[PDB]
Amino acid sequence: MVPISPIETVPVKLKPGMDGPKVKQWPLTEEKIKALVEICTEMEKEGKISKIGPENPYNTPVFAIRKLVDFRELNKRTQDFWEVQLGIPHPAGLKKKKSVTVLDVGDAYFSVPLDEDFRKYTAFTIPSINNETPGIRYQYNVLPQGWKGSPAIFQSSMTKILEPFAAQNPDIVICQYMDDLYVGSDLEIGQHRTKIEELRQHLLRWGLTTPDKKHQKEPPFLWMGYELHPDKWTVQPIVLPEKDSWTVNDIQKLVGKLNWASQIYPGIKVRQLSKLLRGTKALTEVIPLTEEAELELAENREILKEPVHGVYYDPSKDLIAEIQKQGQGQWTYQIYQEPFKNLKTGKYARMRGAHTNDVKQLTEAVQKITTESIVIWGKTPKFKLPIQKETWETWWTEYWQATWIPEWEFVNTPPLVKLWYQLEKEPIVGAETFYVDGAANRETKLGKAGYVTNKGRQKVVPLTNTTNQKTELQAIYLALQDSGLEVNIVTDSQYALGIIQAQPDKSESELVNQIIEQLIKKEKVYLAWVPAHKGIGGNEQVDK
Amino acid sequence: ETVPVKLKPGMDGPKVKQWPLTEEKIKALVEICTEMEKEGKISKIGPENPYNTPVFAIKKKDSTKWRKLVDFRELNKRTQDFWEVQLGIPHPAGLKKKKSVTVLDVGDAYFSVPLDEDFRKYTAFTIPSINNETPGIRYQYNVLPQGWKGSPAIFQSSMTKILEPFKKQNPDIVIYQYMDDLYVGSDLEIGQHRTKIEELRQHLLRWGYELHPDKWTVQPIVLPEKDSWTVNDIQKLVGKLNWASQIYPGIKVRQLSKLLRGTKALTEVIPLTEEAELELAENREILKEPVHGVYYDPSKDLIAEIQKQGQGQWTYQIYQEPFKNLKTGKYARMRGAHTNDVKQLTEAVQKITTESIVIWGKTPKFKLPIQKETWETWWTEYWQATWIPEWEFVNTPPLVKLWYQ
Numbered sequence: 001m002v003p004i005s006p007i008e009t010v011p012v013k014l015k016p017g018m019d020g021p022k023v024k025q026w027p028l029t030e031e032k033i034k035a036l037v038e039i040c041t042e043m044e045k046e047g048k049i050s051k052i053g054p055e056n057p058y059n060t061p062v063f064a065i066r067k068l069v070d071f072r073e074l075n076k077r078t079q080d081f082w083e084v085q086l087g088i089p090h091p092a093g094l095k096k097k098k099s100v101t102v103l104d105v106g107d108a109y110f111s112v113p114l115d116e117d118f119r120k121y122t123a124f125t126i127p128s129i130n131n132e133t134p135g136i137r138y139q140y141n142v143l144p145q146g147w148k149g150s151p152a153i154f155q156s157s158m159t160k161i162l163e164p165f166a167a168q169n170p171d172i173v174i175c176q177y178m179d180d181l182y183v184g185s186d187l188e189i190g191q192h193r194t195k196i197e198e199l200r201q202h203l204l205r206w207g208l209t210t211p212d213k214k215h216q217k218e219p220p221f222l223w224m225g226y227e228l229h230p231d232k233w234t235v236q237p238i239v240l241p242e243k244d245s246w247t248v249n250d251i252q253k254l255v256g257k258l259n260w261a262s263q264i265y266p267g268i269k270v271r272q273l274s275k276l277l278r279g280t281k282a283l284t285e286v287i288p289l290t291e292e293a294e295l296e297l298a299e300n301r302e303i304l305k306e307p308v309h310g311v312y313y314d315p316s317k318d319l320i321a322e323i324q325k326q327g328q329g330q331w332t333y334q335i336y337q338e339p340f341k342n343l344k345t346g347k348y349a350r351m352r353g354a355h356t357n358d359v360k361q362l363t364e365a366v367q368k369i370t371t372e373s374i375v376i377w378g379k380t381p382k383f384k385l386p387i388q389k390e391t392w393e394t395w396w397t398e399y400w401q402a403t404w405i406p407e408w409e410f411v412n413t414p415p416l417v418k419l420w421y422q423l424e425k426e427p428i429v430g431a432e433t434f435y436v437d438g439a440a441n442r443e444t445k446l447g448k449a450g451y452v453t454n455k456g457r458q459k460v461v462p463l464t465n466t467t468n469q470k471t472e473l474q475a476i477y478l479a480l481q482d483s484g485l486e487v488n489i490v491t492d493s494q495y496a497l498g499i500i501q502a503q504p505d506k507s508e509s510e511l512v513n514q515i516i517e518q519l520i521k522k523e524k525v526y527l528a529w530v531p532a533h534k535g536i537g538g539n540e541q542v543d544k
Numbered sequence: 545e546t547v548p549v550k551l552k553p554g555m556d557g558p559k560v561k562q563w564p565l566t567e568e569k570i571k572a573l574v575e576i577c578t579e580m581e582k583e584g585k586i587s588k589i590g591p592e593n594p595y596n597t598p599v600f601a602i603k604k605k606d607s608t609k610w611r612k613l614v615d616f617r618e619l620n621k622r623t624q625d626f627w628e629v630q631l632g633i634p635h636p637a638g639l640k641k642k643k644s645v646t647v648l649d650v651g652d653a654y655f656s657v658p659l660d661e662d663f664r665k666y667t668a669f670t671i672p673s674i675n676n677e678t679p680g681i682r683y684q685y686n687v688l689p690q691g692w693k694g695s696p697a698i699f700q701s702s703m704t705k706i707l708e709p710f711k712k713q714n715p716d717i718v719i720y721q722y723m724d725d726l727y728v729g730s731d732l733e734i735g736q737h738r739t740k741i742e743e744l745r746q747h748l749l750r751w752g753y754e755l756h757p758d759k760w761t762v763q764p765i766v767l768p769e770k771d772s773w774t775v776n777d778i779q780k781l782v783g784k785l786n787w788a789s790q791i792y793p794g795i796k797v798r799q800l801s802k803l804l805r806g807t808k809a810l811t812e813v814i815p816l817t818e819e820a821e822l823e824l825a826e827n828r829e830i831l832k833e834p835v836h837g838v839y840y841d842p843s844k845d846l847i848a849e850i851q852k853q854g855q856g857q858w859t860y861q862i863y864q865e866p867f868k869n870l871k872t873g874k875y876a877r878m879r880g881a882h883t884n885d886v887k888q889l890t891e892a893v894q895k896i897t898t899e900s901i902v903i904w905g906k907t908p909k910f911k912l913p914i915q916k917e918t919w920e921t922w923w924t925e926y927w928q929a930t931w932i933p934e935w936e937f938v939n940t941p942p943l944v945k946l947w948y949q
């Protein structure tokens with residue numbers, strides 16, 4: 001007998017103030033009892049479980065389906081472990097290798113021993129025949145299937161065992177997942193099979209079994225909804241359910257599948273369905289489709305018509321991300337190293353706001369792509385953005401907030417992001433000065449908006465169902481309508497001033513949209529602010 | 545030996561997510577942590593440790609070698625009563641009054657003191673891997689970790705024992721300690737100050753940032769001095785005075801608003817009257833005086849607001865109660881940042897935090913004029929300080945921007 005190398009256990013404790021699980025045993029049939037006895041006998045023969053005397057250990061429920069042990073009340077009371085893996089590796093980040101071998105370790109958790117001080121908590125009882133004899137007591141000596149701390153301890157043990165072999169084999173690359181290992185190399189294929197055999201021999205020195213010789217899975221691999229090919233990657237086929245009664249759960253599943261498909265399928269739009277998912281009332285709620293949503297799903301099926309595949313990453317080539325505006329606050333992007341060979345794709349939807357402009361959304365999309373790229377490839381890509389250098393310079397130099405975009409260049413693919421209007425920094429000589437004002441009565445909702453100018457031009461308009469802020473916006477809008485191509489505007493509204501200093505080009509409020517459309521037609525606009533009710537000349541609060 | 549350290553009553557260790565790092569920073573951290581493991585400063589740990597504190601890498605001034613930095617903010621607030629109440633370090637008010645204050649790094653001495661065995665599990669950190677291809681490396685500290693607020697508290701005794709001779713030799717040299725930073729204030733010439741800093745460094749060697757607070761004062765509120773005033777000039781003046789009236793009560797604007805009476809054009813020159821000139825002069829005199837009753841409460845939080853003025857200009861205010869500023873200042877340094885707003889903002893936040901450390905001995909909470917996403921993406925690429933202040937984000941343009949320019 002060749003002695004197996006020793007592996008050290010992981011000390012496990014319970015949460016503070018919580019005792020072990022002491023749950024009743026649900027009644028089982030006689031066939032289930034016989035099957036459980038047959039299983040546990042061989043399990044004790046293998047050395048994975050031990051028999052405990054009828055003392056006072058903790059009791060965990062067991063059912064038969066192949067057995068099943070339920071540590072549900074133990075998971076609520078077992079301590080917290082470190083996060084095994086938050087995110088899965090993304091195929092676009094993988095580097096091309098001549099050979100890639102998948103090794104799925106069998107009997108993973110049962111090959112690693114359990115903390116001896118914790119085995120007394122992982123004890124269960126098999127009911128005997130007719131409940132005329134005491135039940136059969138068993139406890140676990142290894143990591144149980146379904147225990148909260150089995151994956152973390154297993155992966156730590158696997159890492160500790162794998163470290164020296166990976167260190168002594170620098171000409172191969174090992175990736176460690178939950179219950180699998182992925183070994184890739186650019187060696188001669190015979191040398192690669194030799195190194196795989198050496199790796200599994202190394203794992204067997206510590207007692208870890210893998211598929212012997214071949215019999216291991218060969219490409220294309222089906223892994224985490226992905227299809228991994230030797231020179232490319234894609235996603236597994238997306239199943240789009242079609243019903244004439246679209247329910248809320250259907251739209252949730254469809255949004256999930258479409259977001260999953262958008263990582264390689266360019267042009268996926270999911271806004272019109274999130275608009276139907278805005279309400280979270282009933283999970284079984286038939287919702288009709290808007291014509292915009294119908295055309296959206298039509299073009300989505302048109303995109304999912306012919307298949308597309310992404311390539312693997314090459315560190316020697318540059319990393320490029322190109323952005324396009326799709327409209328309605330939507331952006332799409334492609335990350336590639338060579339033309340027409342995308343590493344991956346994606347989309348970005350604007351945030352929930354009242355006012356916005358294209359430059360801010362483009363900046364946010366750039367930040368998102370930057371974070372994702374640092375996750376996937378560990379570096380920031382060079383950007384190709386539909387915005388001219390001069391536009392970005394004017395924006396970031398005149399913007400009240402700080403802002404920045406990493407290295408990028410202008411790609412001339414419409415629609416281009418542009419600044420639609422720019423307010424002057426100084427009052428305009430020769431331009432008419434419109435002192436505007438608006439005010440509403442809070443009780444009756446009646447108000448007035450208007451202006452007086454230095455040339456004698458005046459206007460007051462009465463309005464029903466309005467507010468102070470709305471009348472101030474309306475006053476500015478009236479001044480914009482009735483003025484020439486150059487105009488100075490004086491207001492006492494901090495609200496309107498803040499809205500216009502946010503520099504929006506699209507708004508939820510149609511009045512702000514009309515103000516923007518008026519500004520767009522202007523040559524020069526200077527917007528000055530003065531304190532209200534301070535006797536400042538042109539500010540005529542008496543006209544309201 | 546080691547000093548036993550515990551947590552607050554009823555709080556658990558830090559479980560903060562590690563944020564993504566570039567490949568070069570990951571490699572620098574791998575090398576640094578391998579070297580530190582070879583020297584017992586850190587040790588690997590298994591999955592039984594559920595605690596995690598973020599970590600990244602920086603580059604100091606005039607040095608191309610990377611440095612490891614742990615974002616101990618969460619762990620610092622988990623042990624806030626240790627380093628302040630129980631083992632706090634006093635703050636001398638004579639440091640800001642000194643002419644030249646030099647900042648040095650004394651983190652290498654913290655690694656010589658072993659850490660309490662029961663507390664090491666709370667200093668766990670994770671070097672991450674690209675694309676999650678391998679389980680990230682996890683370490684815990686065995687010695688006093690840099691960036692932790694309890695480290696200077698614990699090392700205070702050894703620091704006093706080391707600095708006693710140099711303190712007794714030159715008593716006019718003020719010494720202060722904050723985190724891994726040692727501030728040394730003196731009234732000497734820059735040459736002899738550098739020689740004394742060399743002497744102090746050689747003194748620290750055998751036992752195991754040139755600032756000038758003398759050139760800083762609280763900036764007053766200045767009103768323009770013109771010979772002819774337009775309508776726009778008087779409107780801006782009245783707005784600024786109405787704003788300042790929230791700080792100084794006796795401000796009056798009625799005689800100046802009396803000039804704007806009518807609907808004149810903005811560019812039209814309006815002559816000042818005797819009443820308006822007298823009102824402007826009285827406002828000037830009121831603004832020349834300090835603010836009435838402005839005190840510093842060591843129990844309240846310090847708040848630092850920053851406004852971007854364009855062309856590399858930045859204004860800032862440190863206060864605890866609104867309109868009761870404890871300090872104001874400007875910043876316009878041309879040191880390689882003409883085309884990057886975020887780098888300028890990061891350097892300005894660093895300068896303001898250092899000034900706050902010198903003046904009050906604790907960092908303020910910032911209100912940055914930047915979106916959360918941009919800042920959180922880019923601020924780590926320009927940071928050069930061992931400490932990290934707290935910050936929030938203002939996403940509505942303040943009207944008061946030009947009232948500080």
Ligand SMILES: N#Cc1cc2c(Oc3ccc(F)cc3OCCn3ccc(=O)[nH]c3=O)cc(F)cn2c1
Nearest residue numbers: 089094095096097100173182183184221223229230
């Ligand atoms: N099932 C599954 C499975 C396999 C892998 C995976 O494999 C790799 C391991 C090491 C390496 F250096 C490269 C690797 O893959 C690069 C892409 N690739 C693929 C197939 C092929 O034939 N050639 C080729 O280059 C890496 C990972 F992160 C997750 N994985 C899941």
Ligand SMILES: [Mg+2]
Nearest residue numbers: 437438472492
């Ligand atoms: Mg008004």
